Amino acid sequence: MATLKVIGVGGGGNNAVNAMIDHGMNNVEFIAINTDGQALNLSKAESKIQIGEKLTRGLGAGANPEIGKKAAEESREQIEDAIQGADMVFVTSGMGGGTGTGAAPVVAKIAKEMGALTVGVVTRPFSFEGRKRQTQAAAGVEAMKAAVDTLIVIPNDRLLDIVDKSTPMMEAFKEADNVLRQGVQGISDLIAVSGEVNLDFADVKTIMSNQGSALMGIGVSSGENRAVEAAKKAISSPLLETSIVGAQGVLMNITGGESLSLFEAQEAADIVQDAADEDVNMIFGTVINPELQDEIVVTVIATGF
Numbered sequence: 001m002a003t004l005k006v007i008g009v010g011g012g013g014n015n016a017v018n019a020m021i022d023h024g025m026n027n028v029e030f031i032a033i034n035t036d037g038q039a040l041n042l043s044k045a046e047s048k049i050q051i052g053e054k055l056t057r058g059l060g061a062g063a064n065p066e067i068g069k070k071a072a073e074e075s076r077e078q079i080e081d082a083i084q085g086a087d088m089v090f091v092t093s094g095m096g097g098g099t100g101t102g103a104a105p106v107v108a109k110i111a112k113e114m115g116a117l118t119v120g121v122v123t124r125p126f127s128f129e130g131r132k133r134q135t136q137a138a139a140g141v142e143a144m145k146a147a148v149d150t151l152i153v154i155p156n157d158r159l160l161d162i163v164d165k166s167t168p169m170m171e172a173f174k175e176a177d178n179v180l181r182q183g184v185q186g187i188s189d190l191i192a193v194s195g196e197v198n199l200d201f202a203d204v205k206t207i208m209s210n211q212g213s214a215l216m217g218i219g220v221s222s223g224e225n226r227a228v229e230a231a232k233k234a235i236s237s238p239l240l241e242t243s244i245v246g247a248q249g250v251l252m253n254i255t256g257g258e259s260l261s262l263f264e265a266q267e268a269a270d271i272v273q274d275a276a277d278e279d280v281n282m283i284f285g286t287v288i289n290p291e292l293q294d295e296i297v298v299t300v301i302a303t304g305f
Ligand SMILES: Nc1nc2c(ncn2[C@@H]2O[C@H](COP(=O)(O)OP(=O)(O)O)[C@@H](O)[C@H]2O)c(=O)[nH]1
Pocket: 009, 010, 011, 012, 013, 015, 016, 060, 061, 062, 063, 093, 094, 095, 096, 097, 098, 099, 100, 101, 123, 124, 125, 126, 129, 133, 156, 173, 176
């Protein structure tokens, strides 16, 4: 049974971890890493690492990414110890600030050195935060790409596409944080359930290892055209920098009840193949859950851009 860990680095990362913990998420372990002692005390993560106390006196990094970087480096052994034993690590962080920008790539590097398949899920700042934030974030994204196996990037400007004038900011943030949660959950479930055409952690590793950009999606539907609709939802990317277009490898799992037809499994696969507009090398799986009635769930992980 593969050991999955989700590590929040800095404020936005720790917000994403707290959102997942709010949901439940069993067989996933959470680590909270921050310079900011105030926030870190309000984490509900069972493992907390305060970094950079020597540098900051318990405060944040004040928007300087070199302080985040040095803070993580100076706590390398404590970070190693909290990671030790993980088969897979998700590092989540907001790019643009001092702690996430600087520390998240160090954390990712440590994870990969420890032997973990390492996935980054990070945000880019809103345009209203300005040019310097955007430039610092881009340097962070580049540093994350170098350090991780695969990287999912969520530009915060995309949240402006999914709100009306009244949508609470916290509701919008929860949509961004669902990218991480549903991805991690999708992988936990994939590993836990024995499929008729079974996928396992080694298939996740083949798709996610030393790649670059990634997409991780889930789609649920029922009734007429359920398979096409579930697959379309799984690959949709309103919040993602990296869409399905250009994907060269995909892990796709379909879960349905006993009604799950061969024809609709091919319909779903073809949606992904056609949307990619490449010769996709697909790792295909299927689960029959006889407790389902008319529901289908399609899980996609896409890489090789
Ligand atoms: N979507 C989202 N973005 C956030 C959140 N918190 C912070 N950010 C973004 O992440 C960037 C860095 O903020 P933060 O993580 O608090 O900085 P750090 O802790 O000092 O590294 C900000 O400039 C925002 O663009 C959050 O909860 N959700």
